[PDB]
Ligand binder design. Structure first.
Ligand SMILES: *C/C=C(C)/C=C/C=C(C)/C=C/C1=C(C)CCCC1(C)C
Ligand SMILES: *C/C=C(C)/C=C/C=C(C)/C=C/C1=C(C)CCCC1(C)C
Ligand SMILES: CCCCCCCC/C=C\CCCCCCCC(=O)O
Ligand SMILES: CCCCCCCC/C=C\CCCCCCCC(=O)O
Lengths: 282, 282
């Protein structure tokens, strides 16, 4: 049922595998089960829900918050890819060391993670701003994925080496992200904007923290999850980190724009680093 | 000589391949030659030259031009990886569709390409600046690599689909890079700073243009190059785009710092978008 050799014969008391000389690659490890059909159905359900969310968001989404459009476009594009080839090469990489590495997921990360951190870097959406710290957020994060991908393709020790490399990059990514949220909390007005900024932080760290968690629980780690079981949990934290988080960031930037129009753009320097807090009256 | 099955037997008039049931994966396509030993030696030579350059640059390199340090660190780190596992999994991905995808290269791109575009975004190295356009440079470029990687792992039509996807992203990356160089040329002083800025542009577009060129010439494309023969040319444009280009960017930012100290930071608005040209006298 795949584009590689799946039918074979055992010979010489199980010490020889004979396969057809059809030109297809063959490995016994690739034929291990991805999981239970109860988990496959659970994954195929959330695939539509996330796809429906992405479509509802692209509908709903139609300053210019281009960041939300990009991850949503990439998301529902990926689900079109996923519906038709959720386990075909190269959506799933069946490598020479028997590793099934879900490159579809890690590619979607590389496409959307820096765009979320860009949205985080300009949480208020105000003007051509950002900072030098933004580059630290984007350079470190791409690192974690590249190491995390490399770890998933690798096996044994070097998987740990590259996972620990990606973990160290991930620690740098989380801290600089806290420095962004901390300032963003004290920059946005005292109203509901600070409620949604704090909530965006929780959605951020929780969902983002689960990615190295699911890497340890999944086949990439000690395999306490199935390949289907890893697709389920990943979809949940994908939904949290991408579609719901971009929604609040949209709801935040709306509350900012209204406040900026009604009360104007008013700044009151507050000490922490000096932040220009948005206020109501001059 | 690899971590996958390399010894096998033909049976039934060449219609059956029998392999040992040792648990190793097996594919006939993975056993195709990478190239000629004359080309392997040529690749192993430039590997040291690039490694020696990276070491000489890390020596030499020791505002804070952190960007040059990063690609140089990643480069000589990669050569340590390359010297020991230039064709082991997952430095080279032997996938179920017989594709050998050199993930070491594409990972090094993901690690260093956005850092070069960051250096390009702050060519003068002056202050916490950058722009919104920078995000277009970084989002588009990561796209080209992700599609280009996906194309290299893929086969046939979808390789073209993802290559054309990466090509469209690459066109966006090159244009916004020209807009950066064009402004950088008119921002830096009239002296030798404009010579080195123009030269950085030529090193940029030539070496960067060769990457989709070598993708078409290599096994990823019509295979007019060998796998070793692709390692040779890639090293050359790696050397150009990374070590030599970062050197000029260092020589540029030095000429800027001296000019800023001697003549001060003087701006004269010139029309193109309005650029604050660095001048000598007020
Ligand atoms: C939409 C998906 C997002 C925003 C995913 C973010 C994922 C990470 C930050 C993953 C990090 C990992 C580490 C820091 C350790 C190495 C393995 C991990 C990659 C999965
Ligand atoms: C140090 C290496 C660098 C800076 C490499 C840059 C490589 C590219 C911009 C490659 C681009 C490609 C396309 C635009 C078409 C798809 C395939 C390519 C990836 C290799
Ligand atoms: C782990 C070590 C650090 C990984 C992140 C490196 C980012 C460098 C850029 C930071 C900056 O100068 O803004
Ligand atoms: C190919 C289509 C475009 C790829 C690049 C998308 C980048 C969006 C960010 C641009 C910006 O708003 O600055």
């Amino acid at each position: 049922v795949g584009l590689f050799q799946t039918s074979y014969t055992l010979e010489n008391q199980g010490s020889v595998i004979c396969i057809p000389n059809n030109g297809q690659c063959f490995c016994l490890a690739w034929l291990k089960s991805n999981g239970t059909n109860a988990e496959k159905l659970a994954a195929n359900i959330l695939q539509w829900i996330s796809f429906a969310l992405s479509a509802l968001c692209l509908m709903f989404y139609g300053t210019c918050g281009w960041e939300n459009i990009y991850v949503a476009t990439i998301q529902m594009i990926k689900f079109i890819i996923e519906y038709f080839h959720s386990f075909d090469e190269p959506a799933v990489i069946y490598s020479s060391n028997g590793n099934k590495t879900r490159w579809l997921r890690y590619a979607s990360w590389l496409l959307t993670c820096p765009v979320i951190l860009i949205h985080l870097s300009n949480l208020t959406g105000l003007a051509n701003d950002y900072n030098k710290r933004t580059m630290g957020l984007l350079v470190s994060d791409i690192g974690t994925i590249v190491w995390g991908t490399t770890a998933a393709l690798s096996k044994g020790y070097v998987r740990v080496i590259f996972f620990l490399m990606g973990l160290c990059y991930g620690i740098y990514t989380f801290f600089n992200a806290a420095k962004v949220y901390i300032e963003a909390y004290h920059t946005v007005p005292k109203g509901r904007c600070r409620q949604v900024v704090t909530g965006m932080a929780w959605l951020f760290f929780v969902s983002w923290g689960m990615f190295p968690i699911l890497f340890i629980l999944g086949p990439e780690g000690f395999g306490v999850l199935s390949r289907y079981g890893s697709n389920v949990g990943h979809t949940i934290i994908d939904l949290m980190s991408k579609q719901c988080w971009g929604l609040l960031g949209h709801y935040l930037r709306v509350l900012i724009h209204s406040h900026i129009l009604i009360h104007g753009d008013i700044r009151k320097t507050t000490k922490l680093i000096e932040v220009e807090t948005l206020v109501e009256d001059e």
